[PDB]
Design a protein around this ligand. Structure first.
Ligand SMILES: *[B@@]1([O])OC2=C([C]=[C]C(F)=C2C([O])=O)[C]2[C][C]21
Ligand SMILES: [Cl-]
Ligand SMILES: [Cl-]
Ligand SMILES: [Cl-]
Ligand SMILES: [Cl-]
Length: 267
């Protein structure tokens, strides 16, 4: 019943802001889950950048790449919203800093460079998700064209449930070795763009690692987090939204609230 009540609250919140919310959460202590439109597709937006950095980390671990190798791009025309890669244009960045800037600042130059040189483009990114058992995720386009968020368009989309599964496998489970997972965890922990989202839904001294996305169209935004409450097993929370009209603005507060409802449903 607390599951049907959660469904009722999400449905109310979605009407309130005139759009669509998808949620999936997991309590990794009990195995309790809650899903709302958890099999429907939503645009990823910048959110795939958290998986892109996990792909880099897997390559480093297979000794295919070196986390300290310098990545040079002195002549690149930097895509919009390259706040980090812009400052270091002149000197390069390590592979590790560039991957973590894609994650933590949603840096588009970081994103595109890594896809061109290390990951084999949107299809390599998709292929990496297949390699961990994610059949839902697809990436088709590059930054920034992947942000179009057109209603009914499948390109560059996933489901809340698949995103949750994937983050669980990557953040908590077995794809990354001990030393490497710690690195990815700390990357997610120092994410800077998620204070108004999942982090806002949780007590002050819970530790949160997350990655956001903001399409800038169709009021499309999202966040996924790994949550360590005090002295308790971690939670996985995945929250995706879209809005009816092209010029709608995203809703951070709706995301935080959808998180609050989700977290209650699994508790
Ligand atoms: B991505 O969708 O995400 C993004 C961008 C810029 C600033 C941000 F905070 C975020 C985000 O929410 O992660 C650019 C558009 C891409
Ligand atoms: Cl981010
Ligand atoms: Cl889309
Ligand atoms: Cl957050
Ligand atoms: Cl929104």
């Amino acid at each position: 019943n607390k599951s049907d009540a959660a469904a009722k609250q999400i449905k109310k919140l979605e009407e309130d802001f005139d759009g669509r919310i998808g949620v999936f959460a997991i309590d990794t202590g009990s195995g309790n889950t809650f899903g709302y439109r958890s099999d429907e597709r939503f645009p990823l937006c910048s959110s795939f950048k958290g998986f892109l950095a996990a792909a880099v980390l897997e390559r480093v671990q297979q000794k295919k790449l070196d986390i300290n190798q310098k990545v040079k791009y002195e002549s690149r025309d930097l895509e919009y919203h390259s706040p980090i890669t812009t400052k270091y244009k002149g000197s390069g960045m390590t592979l590790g800093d560039m991957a973590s800037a894609a994650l933590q600042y949603s840096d588009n130059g970081a994103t595109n460079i890594i896809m061109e040189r290390f990951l084999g483009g949107p299809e390599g990114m998709t292929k990496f998700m297949r390699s961990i058992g994610d059949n839902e995720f697809r990436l088709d386009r590059w930054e920034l064209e992947l942000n179009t968020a057109i209603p009914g368009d499948k390109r560059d989309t996933s489901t809340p449930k698949a995103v949750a599964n994937s983050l669980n496998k990557l953040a908590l489970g077995n794809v990354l070795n001990a030393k490497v997972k710690a690195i990815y965890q700390n990357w997610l922990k120092g994410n800077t763009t998620g204070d108004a989202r999942i982090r806002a839904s949780v007590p002050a001294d819970w530790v949160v690692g997350d990655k956001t996305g903001s399409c800038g169209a169709y009021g499309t935004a999202n966040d996924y987090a790994v949550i360590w409450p005090k002295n308790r097993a971690p939670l996985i929370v995945s929250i995706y939204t879209t809005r009816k009209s092209k010029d709608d603005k995203h809703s951070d507060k709706t995301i935080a609230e959808a998180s609050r409802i989700a977290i209650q449903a699994i508790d």
